Amino acid sequence: TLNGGITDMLTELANFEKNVSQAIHKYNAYRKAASVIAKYPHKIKSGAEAKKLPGVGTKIAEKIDEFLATGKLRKLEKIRQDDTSSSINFLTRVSGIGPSAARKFVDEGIKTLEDLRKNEDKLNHHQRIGLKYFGDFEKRIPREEMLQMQDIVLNEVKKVDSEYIATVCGSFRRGAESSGDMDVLLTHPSFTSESTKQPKLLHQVVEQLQKVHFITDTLSKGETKFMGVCQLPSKNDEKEYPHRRIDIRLIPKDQYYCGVLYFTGSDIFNKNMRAHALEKGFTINEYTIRPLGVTGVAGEPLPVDSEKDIFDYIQWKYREPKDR
DNA sequence: GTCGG
DNA sequence: GCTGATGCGCC
DNA sequence: CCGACGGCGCATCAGC
Ligand code: NA
Ligand code: NA
């Protein structure tokens, strides 16, 4: 693509700041910069040129000046041939292994997957599973596979109880041809913000989906949220399917559509809707849409029956998931 | 690191 | 055994 | 010149 050399350099740096430096805000900055530049419709020929783009500053422009001049960045070279740093990056690719655990591991000489398998006694549950499915988790999910995944979930949840209301979100709902994980939202008439009845609502669904061997592993579970692994059924003539990440999320009925809206992405679209709404006199978040008082003071959550209503409130014309 | 009060 | 801090992954 | 930049659910460990 365009300025892919630059956008790579920046992402490489972002990851360095998160994993090795533990400097999360520099990480976000570098990302921001990589994403703008990736959107830019010309080949950048100077640092100064880039700078005009919001999120690019003194330091990144100068690093852009150097890459273009020399084809490479001297700081990055240095880092790629630092054993501690590269090893620490690598480890964090395992789900369950963040910068903290990565650093500790490498301090006691554990640097590779091999070293990890050798030491499964030193990993919690999550990490063990991440280890188990390392490659399968880096694979993308073509849209076809998703559809089969959906129907099963939808069916299985129907079987449990006919009043459950599952929606699948993420890229998939927007129509993207491949998606990273599977986010599922869940709700039921018996569950509202006020009417918090007995749980096991989420449990019995998880239970069911284990029972038809669609779910194969649990990374975390609780009253409202589940994270695990799942696998499409083996066609048997052919090669068994790769294991995927699944999240299921139980949300009160009075907050579903705000949940759906939020979790259907993207980062940018929400930030823009939240910013538009902000000045039109409403604050919306994961859970509710609330009007602001004359004084700039949130009143009460407005009722919501659909994604549409949230667009009504701010008089913004509807934008189907397709176009967000 | 970049931005904005 | 408890409660609160922190790590981790997530629009 | 200097703080904000996302806030949350669950698992785990530190401190008592
Ligand atoms: Na700029
Ligand atoms: Na990780």
CATH number of the domain that residue A226 is part of = 3.30.460.10
**Catalytic residue check, A63:** yes
> Is residue A160 located within the same domain as residue A238?
yes
Q: What are phi and psi of A189, to 5 degrees?
A: -50, -35
- Which residues lie below 8 Å from residue A156, measured CB to CB, with a gap of 6+? A205, A208, A209, A212, A214
CATH number of the domain enclosing A22: 1.10.150.110
Cβ atoms within 10 Å of A206's Cβ, excluding its own? 16
Packing angle of the helix pair A4-16, A24-39 (nearest 10 deg): 170
A106 marked as binding residue:
no
> Is residue A21 located within the same domain as residue A119?
no
> Is residue A191 located within the same domain as residue A164?
yes
DSSP string, A242-297: PPEEEEEEE--GGGHHHHHHHHT--HHHHHHHHHHHHHHTEEE-SS-EEEBPTTS-
Q: What angle do CA A48, A12, A273 make, to 5 degrees?
A: 70
> Is residue A156 located within the same domain as residue A229?
yes
Q: Please give the helix or strand (H or E) that residue A185 lies within, else none.
A: strand A182-186
Whole-number distance in Å between A129 CA and C4 C1': 28
Check if residue A291 sits with its Cβ under 7 angstroms from strand B.
no
Inter-residue contact A305 to A257 (CB < 8 Å): yes
Residue A36 C-alpha to ligand 1 middle, in angstroms?
10
Which residue's CA is nearest to the C1' of nucleotide D4? Answer: A25
Q: What is the dihedral of CA A97, A101, A106, A112, to 10 degrees?
A: -20
> Is residue A39 located within the same domain as residue A17?
yes
Q: Please give the helix or strand (H or E) that residue A174 lies within, else none.
A: helix A171-174
Range of the structural domain that residue A49 is part of:
1-82
Q: Count how many domains chain A has.
A: 4
Task: Tell me the C-alpha distance between A70 and A60, whole Å.
Answer: 15
Q: What was the structure determination method?
A: X-ray
Task: Tell me the C-alpha distance between A226 and A162, whole Å.
Answer: 21
Residue A220 C-alpha to ligand 2 middle, in angstroms?
15
Q: What angle do CA A23, A26, A27 make, to 5 degrees?
A: 85
Cβ atoms within 10 Å of A19's Cβ, excluding its own? 23
